[PDB]
Amino acid sequence: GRVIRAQRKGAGSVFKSHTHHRKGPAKFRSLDYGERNGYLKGVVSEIIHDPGRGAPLARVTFRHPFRYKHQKELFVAAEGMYTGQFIYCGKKANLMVGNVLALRSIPEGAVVCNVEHKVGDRGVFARCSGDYAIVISHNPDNGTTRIKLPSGAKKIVPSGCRAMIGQVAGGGRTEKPMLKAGNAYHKYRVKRNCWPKVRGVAMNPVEHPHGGGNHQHIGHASTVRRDAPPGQKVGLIAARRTGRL
């Protein structure tokens, strides 16, 4: 008869993201004439740590195309980039790690990261540490390109979408065991209030479908409907299968 924890997540106010010390969103430059037709040079000024994010971020300074001022940007750092390196963004940029190129100019089999979904969205795919996308094939007829996402899914995107050559830096982070609850506490302290987690069978019936009973047990199949209403949809949602491979 009580709202369950998963339901209470949506309202927020204690489950909102912790973003006080973050350095701002990481994204490409806004797509403009120079990047659409030629190339624009930038210089990496700093590689910084973004709290709550495994991948490091790189500060890049560009010369504004038509204003007398500096154009400052914050890119997701690709492995191998360094302070003082020159970064080239555009259709005519060379195929080197760190450069941002339109997918039409990236040959098949290349390794890219922070791939745009819509032309000009400034990067949504393959952004986490150690992740990358692979260019599969190009379709000149309809101006679309096929890529392989980190999850293994194959997606078709317009060939005008941009991507950064190389893989995201910071790879191999998750292979290290934490060994203790304190490390997880520190990890999630900067992400959101999602830890520790209480098992549903440890609760009373009033606050979870798994609650209750003189023994700890679910008492009914943990696989639930895709259309099950909130508060009832707990456990393995719309599972096509369960158990080991």
Which of residues 58, 81, 129, 145 is near RNA by CB under 7 A?
A: 129
Helices (H) and strands (E) in the chain, counts: 3, 12
Partner from Mg ion, K ion, RNA, none contacting 162, C-beta within 5 to 8 A by type = none
Name residues contacting Mg ion, limited to 180-219 (CB under 5 A): 216
Contact call for residue 230 and K ion (CB under 5 A): no
Contact call for residue 1 and RNA (CB under 7 A): yes
Q: Where are the beta strands (DSSP E) in the chain?
A: 39-48, 57-63, 70-76, 86-90, 100-102, 111-113, 133-139, 144-148, 154-158, 162-165, 223-224, 236-237
Nearer to K ion, 62 or 188 (CB): 188
Question: Any idea which residue has 């520190």 for tokens?
Answer: 186
Nearer to K ion, 143 or 219 (CB): 219
Contact call for residue 80 and RNA (CB under 7 A): no
Which of residues 80, 108, 117, 137 is near RNA by CB under 7 A?
A: 117
What's the min distance (Å) between Cβ of 109 and RNA?
19
Which of residues 121, 136, 138, 146 is near RNA by CB under 7 A?
A: 121
- The amino acid that residue 39 corresponds to is Y
Cβ within 8 Å of residue 79, ≥6 positions away: 97, 166, 167, 168, 169, 170, 171
Q: Is the peptide bond before 196 cis (omega within 30 degrees of 0)?
A: yes
Contact call for residue 63 and K ion (CB under 5 A): no
Interface residue list for Mg ion (CB under 5 A): 216
